[PDB]
Amino acid sequence: TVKYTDAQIQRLREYGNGTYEQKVFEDLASRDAAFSKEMSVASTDNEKKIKGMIANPSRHGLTQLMNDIADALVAEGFIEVRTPIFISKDALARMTITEDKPLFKQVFWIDEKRALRPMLAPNLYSVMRDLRDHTDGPVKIFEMGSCFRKESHSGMHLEEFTMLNLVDMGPRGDATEVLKNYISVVMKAAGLPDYDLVQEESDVYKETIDVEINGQEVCSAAVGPHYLDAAHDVHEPWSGAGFGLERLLTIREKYSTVKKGGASISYLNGAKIN
């Protein structure tokens, strides 16, 4: 008739990758006793993976997820681009991310005119637009890299996160299905073949497609055009999708928090090192 405390659930989540909020116990002593033993099982499992990685080293799991998805997108006809982390204050204004907007509060500022990017759309707007001068068919590009948002104002757990942004500028009568095929290629290559797409009409985009793997947002897609296009010299429909890569890796490997599979000095491929 007692459950793990919130502090105990957190501590179990930081060290183990099982599920713990379901357990129930006769009294406080039995709960604390089973708490320490669940912590003991979590510590052994921790060392077992670290010794495994030390004995059989490999590419980082986040790196391997990026490579698995990226090679899939290239076979789909996408150019991989890399763009700087730094973006300009004018660049944030073209997204209507301005002082009066709440989203403005999450931005890390480098100086008075430059900032860390909170998303991949600014630079990808620039690149797809410039390639339009060099081709008449669809412009298909994508990037994977770190984006940065302050935690207090965005209410999410990672300040540095790796976004995957793919986009295909060009008109399509079948823009929806073509976009849904882009979602499939990513999710398949990511190892998450089952997912629920939330197709929805909108006033701002032509269409919007969220995706959920049992109740959790893992990608946000849309069919253009959008009112942000004209500020970027974009005057045609498009289709794009955005995936948080640490979140996908967390869900595929069933880690307890999102801070275990990505970039860290306390975790390494799900295991806690310190």
- Smallest gap, in angstroms, from Cβ of residue 158 to its own copies? 9
| Alpha carbon separation from 214 to 97, 126, 195, 270 (Å, rounded) | 31, 35, 7, 21
**Element containing residue 47 per DSSP (H, E):** helix 28-55
In the complex with its own copies, the residue whose CB is nearer, 37 or 59, is: 59
Rounded Cα distance, 227 and 225, in Å: 7
Interaction between residue 253 and its own copies (CB under 8 A) = no
Rounded Cα distance, 195 and 209, in Å: 12
- Smallest gap, in angstroms, from Cβ of residue 247 to its own copies? 16
Of 243, 219, 170, 189, the C-alpha closest to 76 is 189
Rounded Cα distance, 64 and 38, in Å: 30
**Which positions from 228 through 247 interact with its own copies, judged by CB under 8 A?**
none
**Element containing residue 29 per DSSP (H, E):** helix 28-55
User: Which span (37-45, 123-131, 185-193, 207-215) binds its own copies, by CB under 8 A?
Assistant: 123-131
User: Which span (5-13, 52-60, 186-194, 214-222) binds its own copies, by CB under 8 A?
Assistant: 52-60
| Residue 143 annotated as part of some ligand binding site | no
In the complex with its own copies, the residue whose CB is nearer, 13 or 140, is: 140
Q: Which two tokens stand for residue 238?
A: 């498009």
| Residue 210 annotated as part of some ligand binding site | yes
User: Which span (36-44, 46-54, 93-101, 195-203) binds its own copies, by CB under 8 A?
Assistant: 46-54
Alpha helices by DSSP H, 76-162: 89-94, 121-132, 151-154
Rounded Cα distance, 229 and 237, in Å: 9
Interaction between residue 44 and its own copies (CB under 8 A) = no
Whether residue 195 contacts residue 213, with contact meaning beta carbons closer than 8 Å, is answered with: yes
Which 3 state secondary structure label does DSSP give 139? strand
| Residue 32 annotated as part of some ligand binding site | no
In the complex with its own copies, the residue whose CB is nearer, 33 or 74, is: 74
**Which positions from 129 through 188 interact with its own copies, judged by CB under 8 A?**
130-131, 133-135, 137, 139-140, 145-146, 148, 159-160
Interaction between residue 77 and its own copies (CB under 8 A) = yes
Pick from 12, 107, 119, 127 the residue near its own copies by CB under 8 A.
127
| Bridge partners, residue 208, by sequence | 200, 222
Rounded Cα distance, 115 and 79, in Å: 26
Pick from 50, 103, 156, 185 the residue near its own copies by CB under 8 A.
50
* Binding region for its own copies (CB under 8 A): 47, 50-51, 53-54, 57-60, 62-63, 67, 70-71, 74, 77-86, 108, 110, 123, 126-127, 130-131, 133-135, 137, 139-140, 145-146, 148, 159-160, 262-265, 268, 273-274
Annotated binding-site residue numbers for Mg(2+): 68, 210, 217, 220
